[PDB]
Amino acid sequence: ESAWGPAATIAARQSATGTKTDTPIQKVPQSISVVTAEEMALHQPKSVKEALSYTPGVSVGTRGASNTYDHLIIRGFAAEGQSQNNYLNGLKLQGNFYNDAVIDPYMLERAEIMRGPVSVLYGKSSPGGLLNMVSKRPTTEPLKEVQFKAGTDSLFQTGFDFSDSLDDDGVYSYRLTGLARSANAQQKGSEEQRYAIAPAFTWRPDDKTNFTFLSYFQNEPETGYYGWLPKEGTVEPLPNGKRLPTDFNEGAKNNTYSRNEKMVGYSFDHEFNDTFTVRQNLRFAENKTSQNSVYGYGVCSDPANAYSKQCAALAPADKGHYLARKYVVDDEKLQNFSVDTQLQSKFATGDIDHTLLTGVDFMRMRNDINAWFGYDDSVPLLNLYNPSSHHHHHHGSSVNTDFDFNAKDPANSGPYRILNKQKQTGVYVQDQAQWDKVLVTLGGRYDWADQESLNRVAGTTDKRDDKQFTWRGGVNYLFDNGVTPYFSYSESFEPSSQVGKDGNIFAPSKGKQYEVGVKYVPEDRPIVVTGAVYNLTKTNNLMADPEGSFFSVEGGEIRARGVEIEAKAALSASVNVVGSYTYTDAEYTTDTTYKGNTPAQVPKHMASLWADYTFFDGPLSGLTLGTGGRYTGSSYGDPANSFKVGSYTVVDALVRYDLARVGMAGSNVALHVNNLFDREYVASCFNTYGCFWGAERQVVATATFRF
Ligand SMILES: CCCCCCCCCC[N+](C)(C)[O-]
Ligand SMILES: CCCCCCCCCC[N+](C)(C)[O-]
């Protein structure tokens, strides 16, 4: 098993996204989870976001049913500005504004999640939280796969995955992965369309050299729903005592959202001798996204719509059943270049063996944004009473009316045109010293984070250059019986793009995490079990100005302390299990407005458990039956902790059938169901006017043939 390739079992022993060197998980001083492609080929997840439902420390309902972005909250934290923090093949998919990219899970070999500070090896980053996906690479043996999907809300997907060698020595091999997917969103009127293909080529001049060209081209005409719904009609009842159906859509009938992605690069490695191996990962990408969207603001009686004329034109006891709305026309295009070069030195010192990594990381991102935002009375209002009727919870909500996205009344709306630039360069050094049953990891990195933003209207140009250092130190005790206790200290830093009263970009916020835990990776049986408790702190966060202005002030602080336990195993050639528990106690240490409050969208308790069984005997031979549940505790729906979103538990089911008994081994037919009991739940809210219905029960029929 290679950290950059398949793991023959649900549970992987090798990972390289925590130390940037192929290392067995037990030997890693930090919480690292690894979702195998096998696991994904088990729930047929719609996204990488989805594929992380059973992984501890990660919330994945920050948007409920929506899959426009794989935006995750890890250990209670996320990138500033609703930005993702996702890496692909060791290089960050730096997005900006609405320009964040997503890779389809079918093109992945494994999706990994690293909890806690990650700058010691990757540069600027939100504290406690990083996602790194590993593209599929040409396989060791021929692979000719064709897959067919069909499901709820008109889901139709056809995809292939082929990989073979051009020569008999395997010096030249390739892999072409592609898919076409179409479906209707949960919300009436909205569609999802995706076309993507991943061309990959591997060149092995010998057994010490590997150059692998990795590319991904994806076009999404319609990405789907991305609106906001009031807590009134979702979490809480509307005046008429009723609620909005989970399929309710408060967007213009003519809402449109698209994204285009193109990227080419490579993962290279060469072994010079017995102590020096060089590896370099490079990628260049140009992604675009545009949109005509009418999203919903709070209900007319929401503090938000206080200054809304349209709202202040209704009988005082009616402002609470009418929905305020706004809009945004967007069109962006960014280019992203990234290259990481590193030298791995292997040498000894007495009874101490060393694995020294030293490398430089570089990236440049440029994103040109040209959008238009509607304000308080930018768009009509929507009455919630009628769409709240039984007839709609019965026969469904109704598509609304078009909207003039062209009309840009200088009154209710305004232009937003910005040119964002970003550059980061870092040099890091780490060593993995092993003194027999003692493994000590220590390393540090220095980053040169430069940014520059041009406001094509204010004609302003805000720039800031951050020089920052972060290091991490940890130790793991290799108990020959599998258990591997460990503890470590790490740091992260995240630049601000905002500017204070002094017309200057704020200084970066930081991450300081203290963590200890134990990892059980028995060498005999194929089972992994990790457990950890930690104390993560994000210092110098932005908070409301005491003087009360339109600007924010720094110095704020938030602490996140909790416990995460996870288990993945192959308790049999017929039994498989995955489960985890998460305890997250995130709280505002220092803050003008929310001291002592817990950040929205992060539940205090989370747990999941999944198990599947396969038959090899009797008339049920080649039959797999699996099921599991995901628990999401209650959480707060706003910074003020005004109201709360209630907990919920969703059950998943699986029935797979090996198609061997028809002259087709390796091929199979399966039925996947998510939210078996079609439970109705508000996934979360980030504010009183921003709530998202969870996903309704979904059924998918899959037929994946292996030729
Ligand atoms: C596989 C581990 C399952 C553990 C589930 C624990 C549920 C804790 C619920 C917390 N509670 C709502 C009761 O406060
Ligand atoms: C997949 C694990 C299932 C855990 C379910 C835990 C439910 C706890 C309910 C406690 N309650 C909310 C009623 O106080």
GROMACS .gro file of N, CA, C and O in nm, residues 161-245:
model
  340
  161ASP      N    1  -1.395   0.421  -1.652
  161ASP     CA    2  -1.266   0.430  -1.585
  161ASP      C    3  -1.174   0.322  -1.642
  161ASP      O    4  -1.177   0.207  -1.599
  162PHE      N    5  -1.091   0.361  -1.739
  162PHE     CA    6  -0.999   0.267  -1.803
  162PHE      C    7  -0.852   0.297  -1.777
  162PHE      O    8  -0.810   0.412  -1.771
  163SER      N    9  -0.773   0.191  -1.764
  163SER     CA   10  -0.631   0.205  -1.738
  163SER      C   11  -0.554   0.082  -1.786
  163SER      O   12  -0.581  -0.030  -1.744
  164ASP      N   13  -0.458   0.105  -1.875
  164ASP     CA   14  -0.376  -0.002  -1.928
  164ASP      C   15  -0.237   0.051  -1.959
  164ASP      O   16  -0.212   0.172  -1.956
  165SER      N   17  -0.145  -0.040  -1.990
  165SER     CA   18  -0.009  -0.002  -2.025
  165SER      C   19   0.006  -0.008  -2.176
  165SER      O   20  -0.060  -0.088  -2.242
  166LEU      N   21   0.090   0.079  -2.230
  166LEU     CA   22   0.113   0.084  -2.374
  166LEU      C   23   0.215  -0.022  -2.416
  166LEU      O   24   0.212  -0.070  -2.530
  167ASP      N   25   0.305  -0.057  -2.325
  167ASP     CA   26   0.407  -0.157  -2.352
  167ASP      C   27   0.396  -0.270  -2.252
  167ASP      O   28   0.326  -0.258  -2.152
  168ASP      N   29   0.466  -0.380  -2.277
  168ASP     CA   30   0.460  -0.495  -2.188
  168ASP      C   31   0.542  -0.479  -2.060
  168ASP      O   32   0.525  -0.557  -1.967
  169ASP      N   33   0.628  -0.379  -2.055
  169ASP     CA   34   0.710  -0.358  -1.937
  169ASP      C   35   0.650  -0.257  -1.840
  169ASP      O   36   0.702  -0.236  -1.730
  170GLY      N   37   0.540  -0.195  -1.880
  170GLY     CA   38   0.475  -0.099  -1.793
  170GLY      C   39   0.550   0.031  -1.777
  170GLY      O   40   0.534   0.101  -1.677
  171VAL      N   41   0.634   0.064  -1.875
  171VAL     CA   42   0.709   0.189  -1.869
  171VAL      C   43   0.614   0.301  -1.910
  171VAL      O   44   0.627   0.415  -1.864
  172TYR      N   45   0.516   0.267  -1.993
  172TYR     CA   46   0.416   0.362  -2.039
  172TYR      C   47   0.275   0.311  -2.008
  172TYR      O   48   0.232   0.209  -2.062
  173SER      N   49   0.205   0.381  -1.921
  173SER     CA   50   0.069   0.344  -1.884
  173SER      C   51  -0.018   0.469  -1.877
  173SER      O   52   0.034   0.581  -1.869
  174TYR      N   53  -0.149   0.451  -1.879
  174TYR     CA   54  -0.241   0.564  -1.874
  174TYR      C   55  -0.366   0.527  -1.794
  174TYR      O   56  -0.382   0.414  -1.749
  175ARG      N   57  -0.454   0.625  -1.779
  175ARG     CA   58  -0.581   0.607  -1.711
  175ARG      C   59  -0.671   0.721  -1.752
  175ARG      O   60  -0.635   0.838  -1.737
  176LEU      N   61  -0.787   0.687  -1.806
  176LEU     CA   62  -0.883   0.788  -1.848
  176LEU      C   63  -1.010   0.766  -1.768
  176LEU      O   64  -1.075   0.662  -1.779
  177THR      N   65  -1.045   0.863  -1.685
  177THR     CA   66  -1.165   0.853  -1.603
  177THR      C   67  -1.260   0.964  -1.645
  177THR      O   68  -1.221   1.080  -1.657
  178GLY      N   69  -1.386   0.929  -1.670
  178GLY     CA   70  -1.481   1.030  -1.711
  178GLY      C   71  -1.623   0.998  -1.670
  178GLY      O   72  -1.655   0.884  -1.637
  179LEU      N   73  -1.710   1.099  -1.673
  179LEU     CA   74  -1.848   1.078  -1.635
  179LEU      C   75  -1.939   1.190  -1.681
  179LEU      O   76  -1.896   1.303  -1.702
  180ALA      N   77  -2.066   1.155  -1.696
  180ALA     CA   78  -2.169   1.249  -1.738
  180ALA      C   79  -2.280   1.227  -1.638
  180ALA      O   80  -2.330   1.115  -1.623
  181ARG      N   81  -2.317   1.332  -1.567
  181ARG     CA   82  -2.421   1.322  -1.465
  181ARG      C   83  -2.524   1.433  -1.477
  181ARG      O   84  -2.491   1.549  -1.503
  182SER      N   85  -2.650   1.395  -1.458
  182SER     CA   86  -2.762   1.489  -1.466
  182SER      C   87  -2.864   1.452  -1.360
  182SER      O   88  -2.884   1.334  -1.330
  183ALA      N   89  -2.928   1.553  -1.302
  183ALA     CA   90  -3.030   1.529  -1.200
  183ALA      C   91  -3.103   1.657  -1.161
  183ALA      O   92  -3.058   1.767  -1.192
  184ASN      N   93  -3.216   1.640  -1.093
  184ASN     CA   94  -3.294   1.754  -1.046
  184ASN      C   95  -3.256   1.773  -0.900
  184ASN      O   96  -3.239   1.674  -0.829
  185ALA      N   97  -3.242   1.897  -0.857
  185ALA     CA   98  -3.207   1.924  -0.717
  185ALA      C   99  -3.328   1.895  -0.627
  185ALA      O  100  -3.438   1.867  -0.675
  186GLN      N  101  -3.306   1.900  -0.497
  186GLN     CA  102  -3.414   1.876  -0.402
  186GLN      C  103  -3.517   1.989  -0.418
  186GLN      O  104  -3.638   1.966  -0.420
  187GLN      N  105  -3.466   2.111  -0.432
  187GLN     CA  106  -3.548   2.230  -0.447
  187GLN      C  107  -3.606   2.242  -0.588
  187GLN      O  108  -3.532   2.236  -0.687
  188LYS      N  109  -3.737   2.261  -0.596
  188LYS     CA  110  -3.806   2.272  -0.724
  188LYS      C  111  -3.747   2.375  -0.817
  188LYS      O  112  -3.716   2.487  -0.777
  189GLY      N  113  -3.732   2.335  -0.943
  189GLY     CA  114  -3.678   2.424  -1.043
  189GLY      C  115  -3.529   2.414  -1.067
  189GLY      O  116  -3.480   2.447  -1.175
  190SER      N  117  -3.454   2.368  -0.966
  190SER     CA  118  -3.309   2.358  -0.980
  190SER      C  119  -3.253   2.226  -1.031
  190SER      O  120  -3.295   2.117  -0.991
  191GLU      N  121  -3.154   2.238  -1.120
  191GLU     CA  122  -3.090   2.122  -1.180
  191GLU      C  123  -2.941   2.113  -1.150
  191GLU      O  124  -2.877   2.211  -1.112
  192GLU      N  125  -2.887   1.994  -1.171
  192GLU     CA  126  -2.745   1.965  -1.151
  192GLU      C  127  -2.696   1.892  -1.275
  192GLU      O  128  -2.754   1.791  -1.314
  193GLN      N  129  -2.591   1.945  -1.336
  193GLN     CA  130  -2.534   1.884  -1.455
  193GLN      C  131  -2.383   1.884  -1.439
  193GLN      O  132  -2.325   1.983  -1.396
  194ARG      N  133  -2.320   1.773  -1.474
  194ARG     CA  134  -2.175   1.766  -1.464
  194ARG      C  135  -2.113   1.674  -1.568
  194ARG      O  136  -2.155   1.560  -1.587
  195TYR      N  137  -2.012   1.727  -1.636
  195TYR     CA  138  -1.938   1.652  -1.735
  195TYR      C  139  -1.794   1.669  -1.691
  195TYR      O  140  -1.748   1.781  -1.670
  196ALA      N  141  -1.724   1.558  -1.673
  196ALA     CA  142  -1.586   1.565  -1.629
  196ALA      C  143  -1.506   1.447  -1.680
  196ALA      O  144  -1.558   1.336  -1.691
  197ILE      N  145  -1.380   1.472  -1.711
  197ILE     CA  146  -1.291   1.368  -1.759
  197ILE      C  147  -1.151   1.393  -1.703
  197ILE      O  148  -1.102   1.506  -1.702
  198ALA      N  149  -1.088   1.286  -1.655
  198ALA     CA  150  -0.954   1.295  -1.597
  198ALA      C  151  -0.851   1.213  -1.673
  198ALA      O  152  -0.840   1.091  -1.655
  199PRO      N  153  -0.773   1.279  -1.761
  199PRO     CA  154  -0.669   1.213  -1.840
  199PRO      C  155  -0.543   1.202  -1.753
  199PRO      O  156  -0.499   1.301  -1.695
  200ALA      N  157  -0.486   1.082  -1.743
  200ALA     CA  158  -0.365   1.061  -1.664
  200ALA      C  159  -0.266   0.973  -1.740
  200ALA      O  160  -0.305   0.877  -1.808
  201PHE      N  161  -0.138   1.005  -1.730
  201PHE     CA  162  -0.035   0.929  -1.799
  201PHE      C  163   0.084   0.909  -1.707
  201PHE      O  164   0.130   1.004  -1.643
  202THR      N  165   0.133   0.786  -1.699
  202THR     CA  166   0.248   0.754  -1.615
  202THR      C  167   0.367   0.701  -1.695
  202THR      O  168   0.353   0.613  -1.780
  203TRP      N  169   0.484   0.756  -1.665
  203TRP     CA  170   0.606   0.716  -1.732
  203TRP      C  171   0.705   0.668  -1.628
  203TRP      O  172   0.743   0.743  -1.538
  204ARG      N  173   0.744   0.541  -1.638
  204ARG     CA  174   0.839   0.480  -1.546
  204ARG      C  175   0.964   0.435  -1.623
  204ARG      O  176   0.977   0.318  -1.658
  205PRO      N  177   1.058   0.528  -1.648
  205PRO     CA  178   1.180   0.494  -1.721
  205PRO      C  179   1.249   0.374  -1.658
  205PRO      O  180   1.317   0.296  -1.725
  206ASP      N  181   1.229   0.361  -1.527
  206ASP     CA  182   1.290   0.253  -1.450
  206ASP      C  183   1.214   0.238  -1.319
  206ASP      O  184   1.105   0.292  -1.303
  207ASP      N  185   1.274   0.167  -1.224
  207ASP     CA  186   1.211   0.144  -1.094
  207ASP      C  187   1.248   0.247  -0.987
  207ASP      O  188   1.227   0.223  -0.868
  208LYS      N  189   1.303   0.360  -1.029
  208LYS     CA  190   1.341   0.465  -0.935
  208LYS      C  191   1.295   0.601  -0.987
  208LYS      O  192   1.325   0.705  -0.928
  209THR      N  193   1.221   0.598  -1.098
  209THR     CA  194   1.172   0.720  -1.159
  209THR      C  195   1.026   0.707  -1.202
  209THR      O  196   0.988   0.611  -1.268
  210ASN      N  197   0.946   0.806  -1.163
  210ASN     CA  198   0.804   0.808  -1.197
  210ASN      C  199   0.755   0.949  -1.224
  210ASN      O  200   0.758   1.034  -1.135
  211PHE      N  201   0.711   0.974  -1.346
  211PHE     CA  202   0.656   1.103  -1.382
  211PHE      C  203   0.511   1.077  -1.419
  211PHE      O  204   0.484   1.006  -1.516
  212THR      N  205   0.418   1.132  -1.342
  212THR     CA  206   0.277   1.109  -1.373
  212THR      C  207   0.198   1.235  -1.402
  212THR      O  208   0.174   1.316  -1.313
  213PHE      N  209   0.159   1.249  -1.528
  213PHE     CA  210   0.081   1.362  -1.576
  213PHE      C  211  -0.063   1.344  -1.529
  213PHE      O  212  -0.129   1.245  -1.563
  214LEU      N  213  -0.110   1.439  -1.450
  214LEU     CA  214  -0.245   1.437  -1.396
  214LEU      C  215  -0.325   1.558  -1.444
  214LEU      O  216  -0.283   1.672  -1.428
  215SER      N  217  -0.440   1.532  -1.505
  215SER     CA  218  -0.523   1.641  -1.553
  215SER      C  219  -0.670   1.617  -1.519
  215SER      O  220  -0.713   1.503  -1.497
  216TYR      N  221  -0.746   1.726  -1.514
  216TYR     CA  222  -0.888   1.721  -1.483
  216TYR      C  223  -0.959   1.834  -1.557
  216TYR      O  224  -0.925   1.951  -1.542
  217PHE      N  225  -1.058   1.797  -1.638
  217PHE     CA  226  -1.136   1.895  -1.712
  217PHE      C  227  -1.281   1.870  -1.675
  217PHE      O  228  -1.330   1.757  -1.688
  218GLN      N  229  -1.349   1.973  -1.626
  218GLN     CA  230  -1.488   1.960  -1.586
  218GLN      C  231  -1.571   2.082  -1.620
  218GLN      O  232  -1.528   2.196  -1.603
  219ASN      N  233  -1.691   2.056  -1.669
  219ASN     CA  234  -1.785   2.160  -1.708
  219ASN      C  235  -1.922   2.133  -1.646
  219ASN      O  236  -1.982   2.028  -1.667
  220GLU      N  237  -1.970   2.229  -1.568
  220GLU     CA  238  -2.100   2.217  -1.501
  220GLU      C  239  -2.194   2.330  -1.541
  220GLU      O  240  -2.184   2.440  -1.488
  221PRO      N  241  -2.286   2.304  -1.636
  221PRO     CA  242  -2.383   2.404  -1.684
  221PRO      C  243  -2.468   2.460  -1.569
  221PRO      O  244  -2.484   2.581  -1.556
  222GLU      N  245  -2.523   2.371  -1.488
  222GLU     CA  246  -2.603   2.411  -1.372
  222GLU      C  247  -2.553   2.336  -1.249
  222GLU      O  248  -2.550   2.213  -1.247
  223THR      N  249  -2.513   2.412  -1.147
  223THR     CA  250  -2.463   2.353  -1.024
  223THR      C  251  -2.571   2.328  -0.918
  223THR      O  252  -2.549   2.254  -0.823
  224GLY      N  253  -2.687   2.392  -0.934
  224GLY     CA  254  -2.796   2.371  -0.839
  224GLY      C  255  -2.831   2.480  -0.739
  224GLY      O  256  -2.795   2.597  -0.756
  225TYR      N  257  -2.900   2.439  -0.633
  225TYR     CA  258  -2.945   2.529  -0.527
  225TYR      C  259  -2.833   2.581  -0.437
  225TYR      O  260  -2.742   2.507  -0.400
  226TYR      N  261  -2.841   2.709  -0.401
  226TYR     CA  262  -2.742   2.771  -0.314
  226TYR      C  263  -2.805   2.889  -0.241
  226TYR      O  264  -2.737   2.987  -0.206
  227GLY      N  265  -2.935   2.879  -0.215
  227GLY     CA  266  -3.005   2.987  -0.149
  227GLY      C  267  -3.015   2.973   0.001
  227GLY      O  268  -2.972   2.874   0.058
  228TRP      N  269  -3.071   3.076   0.065
  228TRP     CA  270  -3.090   3.078   0.209
  228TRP      C  271  -3.239   3.076   0.241
  228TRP      O  272  -3.319   3.137   0.170
  229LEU      N  273  -3.275   3.008   0.349
  229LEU     CA  274  -3.414   3.001   0.394
  229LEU      C  275  -3.417   3.048   0.538
  229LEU      O  276  -3.327   3.019   0.617
  230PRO      N  277  -3.523   3.122   0.575
  230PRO     CA  278  -3.537   3.173   0.712
  230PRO      C  279  -3.555   3.058   0.810
  230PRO      O  280  -3.601   2.950   0.771
  231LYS      N  281  -3.519   3.081   0.936
  231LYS     CA  282  -3.536   2.976   1.037
  231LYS      C  283  -3.687   2.963   1.054
  231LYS      O  284  -3.737   2.861   1.099
  232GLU      N  285  -3.758   3.069   1.015
  232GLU     CA  286  -3.904   3.073   1.024
  232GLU      C  287  -3.963   3.003   0.902
  232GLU      O  288  -3.971   3.060   0.794
  233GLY      N  289  -4.004   2.879   0.922
  233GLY     CA  290  -4.061   2.802   0.813
  233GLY      C  291  -3.979   2.676   0.794
  233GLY      O  292  -4.016   2.587   0.718
  234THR      N  293  -3.866   2.670   0.865
  234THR     CA  294  -3.776   2.556   0.859
  234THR      C  295  -3.752   2.501   0.999
  234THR      O  296  -3.812   2.399   1.038
  235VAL      N  297  -3.667   2.568   1.076
  235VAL     CA  298  -3.638   2.525   1.213
  235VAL      C  299  -3.757   2.556   1.302
  235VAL      O  300  -3.798   2.475   1.385
  236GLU      N  301  -3.811   2.677   1.285
  236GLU     CA  302  -3.925   2.724   1.363
  236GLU      C  303  -4.049   2.737   1.275
  236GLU      O  304  -4.040   2.758   1.154
  237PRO      N  305  -4.168   2.723   1.335
  237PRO     CA  306  -4.291   2.733   1.258
  237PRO      C  307  -4.320   2.874   1.210
  237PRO      O  308  -4.275   2.971   1.271
  238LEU      N  309  -4.393   2.885   1.100
  238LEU     CA  310  -4.434   3.015   1.047
  238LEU      C  311  -4.557   3.056   1.129
  238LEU      O  312  -4.613   2.974   1.203
  239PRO      N  313  -4.600   3.183   1.118
  239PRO     CA  314  -4.717   3.229   1.193
  239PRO      C  315  -4.835   3.133   1.181
  239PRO      O  316  -4.896   3.095   1.280
  240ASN      N  317  -4.867   3.094   1.057
  240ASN     CA  318  -4.976   3.003   1.033
  240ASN      C  319  -4.945   2.865   1.089
  240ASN      O  320  -5.008   2.766   1.051
  241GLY      N  321  -4.848   2.859   1.180
  241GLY     CA  322  -4.809   2.734   1.243
  241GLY      C  323  -4.754   2.626   1.151
  241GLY      O  324  -4.728   2.515   1.197
  242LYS      N  325  -4.736   2.658   1.023
  242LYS     CA  326  -4.684   2.559   0.928
  242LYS      C  327  -4.539   2.587   0.889
  242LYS      O  328  -4.481   2.689   0.927
  243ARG      N  329  -4.480   2.496   0.813
  243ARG     CA  330  -4.342   2.510   0.767
  243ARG      C  331  -4.329   2.498   0.616
  243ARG      O  332  -4.422   2.455   0.547
  244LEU      N  333  -4.213   2.538   0.565
  244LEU     CA  334  -4.186   2.530   0.422
  244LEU      C  335  -4.142   2.388   0.391
  244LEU      O  336  -4.062   2.329   0.465
  245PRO      N  337  -4.195   2.328   0.284
  245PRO     CA  338  -4.153   2.192   0.251
  245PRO      C  339  -4.004   2.188   0.215
  245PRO      O  340  -3.949   2.283   0.159
   0.00000   0.00000   0.00000
